[PDB]
């Protein structure tokens, strides 16, 4: 699959703006303090049709299994309770998450040897950006 350019081990190698991107969304301090430190990794999978996003860091772990196209339920390592629905977009895995009347959408996409993560809320977008472990 061309989902293939994604599957890996991927760790964070920068950040920027991530800090108000949680603000925007309505996380609270202590969280974003403690979650702004992680370095985490990323692990994605695909098994048929069914994908798998892993986050492990020092301050949670969270996993997302689903098939393109397909909402589904996701609690957030914030602790939001969304809504979630994954596309592939030419090339770029867009995710969107619907709580409470608001909405973010974040985008994973590769470049170079990156896989770069675009998350937006409002106005506001943080990038972070990972490299292959
Ligand atoms: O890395 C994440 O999966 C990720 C995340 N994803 C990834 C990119 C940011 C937007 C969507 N969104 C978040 C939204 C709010 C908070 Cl408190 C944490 C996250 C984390 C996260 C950050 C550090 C450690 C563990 C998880």
């Given at each position: ?39 985490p990794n990323m692990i ?10 892993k986050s492990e860091s020092?301050?949670?772990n ?72």
């Open positions: 699959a061309m989902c293939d350019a994604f599957v890996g081990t991927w760790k964070l190698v920068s950040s920027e703006n991530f800090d108000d991107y949680m603000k925007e969304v309505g996380v609270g301090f202590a969280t974003r303090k403690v979650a702004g430190m992680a370095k994605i999978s695909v098994n048929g049709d069914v994908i798998t996003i020092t301050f949670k969270t996993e997302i299994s689903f098939i393109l196209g397909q909402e589904f339920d996701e609690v957030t390592a914030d602790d939001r309770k969304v809504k979630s629905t994954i596309t592939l977009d030419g090339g770029v895995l867009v995710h969107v998450q619907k709580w409470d009347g608001k909405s973010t959408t974040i985008k994973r996409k590769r470049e170079d040897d990156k896989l770069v993560v675009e998350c937006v809320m409002k106005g506001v977008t943080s990038t972070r950006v990972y490299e292959r472990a």
